[PDB]
Design an enzyme around this catalytic site. Structure first.
Site, short mmCIF file in Angstrom:
data_model
loop_
_atom_site.label_atom_id
_atom_site.label_comp_id
_atom_site.label_asym_id
_atom_site.label_seq_id
_atom_site.Cartn_x
_atom_site.Cartn_y
_atom_site.Cartn_z
CG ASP A 10 -1.14 -2.51 0.33
OD1 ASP A 10 -1.38 -3.52 -0.34
OD2 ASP A 10 -0.22 -2.43 1.17
N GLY A 11 -3.93 -3.54 -1.10
CA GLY A 11 -5.00 -4.50 -1.01
C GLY A 11 -4.52 -5.64 -0.09
CD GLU A 48 -2.02 -7.08 -4.59
OE1 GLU A 48 -1.74 -7.37 -5.73
OE2 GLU A 48 -1.47 -7.61 -3.59
CG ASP A 70 3.50 -3.02 -1.80
OD1 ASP A 70 2.34 -3.24 -2.22
OD2 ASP A 70 3.83 -3.24 -0.62
CG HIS A 124 11.75 -3.56 2.18
ND1 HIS A 124 11.60 -4.21 1.00
CD2 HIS A 124 12.93 -2.90 2.14
CE1 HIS A 124 12.67 -3.98 0.26
NE2 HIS A 124 13.46 -3.18 0.91
CG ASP A 134 0.17 -2.94 4.71
OD1 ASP A 134 -0.39 -3.96 4.31
OD2 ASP A 134 1.11 -2.98 5.53
#
Length: 155
Positions: A10-11, A48, A70, A124, A134
């Site tokens: 994640d970023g 990311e 994601d 989500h 995250d």
């Protein structure tokens, strides 16, 4: 002992440009390694990409990997752009270097050492490891210590 290397990334970024960071979780050999760093002035897309970069570069031999994220930007690059950019010498249709060519080239180099299976999760509905990423990306962005050298308002 897992038979496949598992990577989660994640970023995050507070502005455009702004302070940003990444979180990555790597399950390799018999450990769970966690990477996280914040950059003073960067973008969400660069973070990311950075997440995936750092996790892959930790791999010292050719592995079979499953990478879960994601990130729309990474997915887009992987599925629609990369192939065509290598054919074109990493240029846009108006003949300039591609955006974040520095990171995409770096990533590409790491990709070519392994057998990769990409898993495109929805924000989500990711695993516990994606949420964790995250949280680390966000915390890192609040306390940046490195400089994102390749960032350009520009090219």
């Amino acid at each position: 002992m897992l038979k496949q290397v598992e990577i989660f990334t994640d970023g995050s970024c507070l502005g455009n440009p702004g302070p940003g960071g990444y979180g990555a979780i790597l399950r390799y050999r018999g450990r769970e390694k966690t990477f996280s760093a914040g950059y003073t002035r960067t973008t969400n897309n660069r973070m990311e990409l950075m997440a995936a970069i750092v996790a892959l570069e930790a791999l010292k031999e050719h592995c079979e990997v499953i990478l879960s994220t994601d990130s729309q930007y990474v997915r887009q690059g992987i599925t629609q752009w990369i192939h065509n950019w290598k054919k074109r010498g990493w240029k846009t249709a108006d003949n300039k270097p591609v955006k974040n060519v520095d990171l995409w080239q770096r990533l590409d180099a790491a990709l070519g050492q392994h057998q990769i299976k990409w898993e495109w999760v929805k924000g989500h509905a990711g695993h516990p490891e994606n949420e964790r990423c995250d949280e680390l990306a966000r915390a890192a962005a609040m306390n940046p210590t490195l400089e994102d050298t390749g960032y350009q308002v520009e090219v």
